[PDB]
Amino acid sequence: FKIETTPESRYLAQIGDSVSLTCSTTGCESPFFSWRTQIDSPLNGKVTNEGTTSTLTMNPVSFGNEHSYLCTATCESRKLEKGIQVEIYSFPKDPEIHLSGPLEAGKPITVKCSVADVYPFDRLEIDLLKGDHLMKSQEFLEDADRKSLETKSLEVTFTPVIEDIGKVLVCRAKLHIDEMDSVPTVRQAVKELQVYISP
């Protein structure tokens, strides 16, 4: 009688997505499965028991799924248990680059880069680069008062020059959560620079 879960011990789950946790056994003819969180609150998920497996589906993942979920498998009078820690975040869209007007050599241009629906925002770092050089970087260490999706942004004003033609402006958003590589730390927007001369 052995208990097995997928994932092994942790799932980085994105708010709004449809995610499933599975608990299984080998060596048991008719196991019964039971799920609970460490604080015995609702699961905010649907449990389906079939054969030698139990699936806990969270659809959609919400803030109510940030728990250590525990599966208990009962085989006759024996019980084995294994826990899966569910960690949540939101990073659904690439950054958006807003420009105050066309780039004109010698005239100021204001660039605004925003990333929508982020969580946890206190872990976001926004980089603005021109070519391969960083113009401005913004962190948001101001600790979150609660749990919600937030839109954050970085703004910079610079004066374009003729040699900026062909350079690419890149707005890079990095979310610092322990990585479960399949879920990226980075998202970026690129815009090739067309510079206009003024007659």
Side-chain angles (χ1 to χ4, degrees):
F1 171 37
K2 289 178 168 190
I3 196 184
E4 222 180 344
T5 60
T6 62
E8 179 67 88
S9 45
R10 176 188 164 269
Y11 204 108
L12 226 202
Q14 179 169 63
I15 290 174
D17 286 347
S18 177
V19 164
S20 294
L21 264 34
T22 77
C23 191
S24 286
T25 57
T26 51
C28 184
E29 185 175 308
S30 308
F32 186 76
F33 299 90
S34 188
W35 292 91
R36 74 184 194 287
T37 70
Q38 268 191 103
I39 57 162
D40 301 298
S41 50
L43 299 179
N44 292 311
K46 178 221 177 103
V47 177
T48 294
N49 286 173
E50 212 171 358
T52 51
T53 199
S54 183
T55 296
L56 165 45
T57 302
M58 300 165 284
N59 190 200
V61 171
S62 70
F63 281 105
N65 295 114
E66 179 158 49
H67 291 288
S68 182
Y69 283 88
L70 282 130
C71 174
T72 298
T74 303
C75 193
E76 290 174 304
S77 49
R78 293 166 293 159
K79 285 176 201 281
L80 290 187
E81 76 195 338
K82 204 152 184 304
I84 301 168
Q85 213 197 101
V86 177
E87 288 190 60
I88 64 172
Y89 76 99
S90 195
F91 201 35
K93 37 222 189 188
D94 285 316
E96 272 184 74
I97 293 171
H98 302 95
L99 292 170
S100 51
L103 286 105
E104 266 185 65
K107 306 219 166 56
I109 183 79
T110 296
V111 180
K112 185 193 194 167
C113 183
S114 56
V115 207
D117 308 328
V118 179
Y119 180 84
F121 83 67
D122 60 81
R123 309 306 294 163
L124 176 72
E125 196 184 17
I126 303 186
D127 281 2
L128 197 82
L129 299 96
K130 174 154 65 63
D132 294 320
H133 305 95
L134 186 65
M135 298 199 315
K136 196 186 190 169
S137 183
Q138 183 94 66
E139 286 192 348
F140 296 93
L141 85 184
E142 177 243 309
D143 301 312
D145 56 278
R146 195 178 274 257
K147 297 166 188 289
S148 55
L149 266 32
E150 299 302 344
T151 295
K152 296 278 136 167
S153 61
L154 174 168
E155 256 187 39
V156 74
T157 302
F158 74 106
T159 296
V161 294
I162 248 56
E163 26 282 303
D164 284 327
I165 196 187
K167 292 197 172 176
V168 302
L169 242 201
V170 318
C171 185
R172 201 169 64 198
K174 301 168 280 174
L175 194 54
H176 293 94
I177 49 179
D178 269 61
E179 302 151 30
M180 170 195 102
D181 269 292
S182 277
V183 30
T185 254
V186 189
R187 282 194 172 272
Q188 62 178 36
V190 171
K191 172 101 61 166
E192 287 174 278
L193 297 181
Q194 181 53 255
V195 178
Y196 287 104
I197 64 188
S198 214

Coordinates of all heavy atoms in Angstrom, one line a residue, residues 22 43 55 77 110 134 159-160 182:
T22 N -3.6 15.4 -8.0 CA -4.0 14.0 -8.0 C -3.3 13.2 -6.9 O -2.1 13.4 -6.5 CB -4.0 13.2 -9.3 OG1 -2.6 12.9 -9.7 CG2 -4.5 14.1 -10.5
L43 N -12.3 23.5 0.7 CA -11.2 23.2 -0.3 C -11.2 24.2 -1.5 O -10.2 24.4 -2.1 CB -11.4 21.8 -0.9 CG -11.4 20.6 0.1 CD1 -11.6 19.3 -0.7 CD2 -10.0 20.6 0.8
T55 N -9.0 13.0 -7.7 CA -8.6 14.3 -8.3 C -9.2 15.5 -7.6 O -10.4 15.4 -7.4 CB -8.9 14.3 -9.9 OG1 -8.2 13.3 -10.5 CG2 -8.5 15.6 -10.5
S77 N -8.0 -0.8 7.3 CA -7.9 0.0 8.5 C -6.6 0.8 8.5 O -6.3 1.4 9.6 CB -8.0 -0.9 9.7 OG -7.2 -2.0 9.6
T110 N 7.8 60.8 -23.6 CA 7.5 60.1 -22.3 C 7.0 58.7 -22.6 O 6.1 58.5 -23.4 CB 6.4 60.9 -21.5 OG1 7.0 62.2 -21.1 CG2 6.1 60.2 -20.2
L134 N 20.0 49.7 -19.9 CA 18.9 50.0 -19.0 C 18.7 51.5 -18.7 O 19.7 52.1 -18.3 CB 19.2 49.2 -17.7 CG 18.2 49.2 -16.5 CD1 17.0 48.4 -17.0 CD2 18.9 48.4 -15.4
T159 N 15.2 62.1 -24.4 CA 15.2 62.8 -25.6 C 15.8 61.9 -26.7 O 17.0 61.5 -26.6 CB 16.0 64.1 -25.5 OG1 15.3 65.0 -24.6 CG2 16.0 64.8 -26.9
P160 N 15.1 61.5 -27.7 CA 15.7 60.6 -28.7 C 16.7 61.4 -29.5 O 16.7 62.6 -29.6 CB 14.5 60.3 -29.6 CG 13.2 60.7 -28.8 CD 13.7 61.8 -28.0
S182 N 8.1 26.3 -15.9 CA 7.1 26.0 -16.8 C 6.2 27.3 -16.7 O 5.5 27.6 -17.6 CB 6.3 24.7 -16.4 OG 6.9 23.5 -16.8

